[PDB]
């Protein structure tokens, strides 16, 4: 996605839950750091379209495999640690502004395929407890994750009853 006037790239994030209130947790490709799926919003994409493209390209799933249960309204932003800022572009990107989606997986676990890209976002995934991501994502994304998971909590725990 294109860097905006303030240095932020527009992006979407995806929290995928099951009926037991667990959420899909994925290992960043070639790292031991885990996160939710996130991807850029291209010009002429809506947030929801960009979400479904991320879902297909990095999780292998269709609209028909999920249902949308909630979404955040306005951007939430994180800034990159200055060490990880890439200076090989103009304008330089300092972080992301993100819109988030809560999806329920309704197809079988085996429909998820994280290996279809030549450069996958992830090595693979596992189910984790709902709040585990807030404490386990890389530090500079924790403020965003805490806000997202708090906003989505009302909907997920009702399913887990
Ligand atoms: N746990 C993490 C998260 C991020 N990064 C680094 O910080 C950059 C920015 O991370 P992020 O904002 O999550 O975006 P990307 O992973 O680069 O993904 P995208 O191409 O969709 O922007 C990454 O390229 C990576 O070098 C990292 O090293 N370890
Ligand atoms: N990580 C965050 C947190 C907040 N906001 C912006 O700040 C608003 C929330 O402000 P508030 O709840 O009042 O918290 P703070 O006073 O900023 O602390 C959101 O709509 C968002 O636009 C953001 O962009 N990125
Ligand atoms: N509670 C928060 C956290 C973040 N933000 C927005 O999201 C960006 C990322 O937040 P943060 O990393 O915490 O900013 P800092 O680099 O710590 O400090 P400064 O932003 O003042 O240069 C902020 O610029 C802000 O616009 C916000 O409005 N309210």
Phi and psi (nearest 5°) for 90?
-130, 135
Identify the architecture of domain 1-161 in CATH: Alpha-Beta Complex (3.90)
**Residue 158 CB less than 6 A away from ligand 1:** no
Method used to solve the structure:
X-ray
In the DSSP assignment, the letter for residue 66 is E
In the DSSP assignment, the letter for residue 119 is S
SS3 per residue for 69-111: EEECCCCEEEECCHHHCCCCCCCCCCEEEEEEEEEEECCCHHH
- 36: buried, middle or exposed (CB in 10 Å: 19+, 13-18, 0-12)? buried
Cα–Cα dist 17/31, whole Å: 23
Q: Nearest CA to 156 among 25, 16, 35, 59? A: 16
Give the number of whichever ligand sits closest to the CA of residue 96: 1
Q: What is the whole-number distance in angstroms between the Cα of residue 113 and the centre of ligand 2?
A: 34
Q: Which atom of ligand 2 approaches the CA of 74 most closely?
A: 20
Cα torsion for 128, 32, 98, 90, to the nearest 10°?
-170
């Amino acid at each position: 996605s294109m860097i905006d006037d303030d240095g932020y790239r527009p992006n979407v994030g995806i929290v995928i839950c099951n009926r037991q209130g667990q959420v899909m947790w994925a290992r960043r490709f070639g790292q031991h750091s885990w996160q939710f799926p996130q991807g850029g919003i291209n010009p002429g994409e809506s947030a929801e379209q960009a979400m479904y493209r991320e879902l297909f390209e990095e999780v292998g799933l269709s609209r028909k495999d999920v249902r949308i249960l909630a979404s955040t309204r306005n951007w939430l932003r994180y800034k990159l640690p200055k060490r990880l800022v890439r200076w090989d572009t103009k304008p330089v990107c300092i972080g992301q502004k993100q819109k988030w989606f809560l999806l329920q997986l309704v197809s079988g676990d085996a429909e998820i395929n994280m290996q279809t890209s030549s450069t996958p976002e992830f090595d693979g995934w596992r189910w984790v407890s709902y709040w585990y991501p807030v404490r386990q994502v890389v530090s500079f994304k924790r403020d965003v994750y805490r806000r997202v998971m708090k906003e989505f909590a009302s909907v997920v725990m009702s399913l887990a009853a």
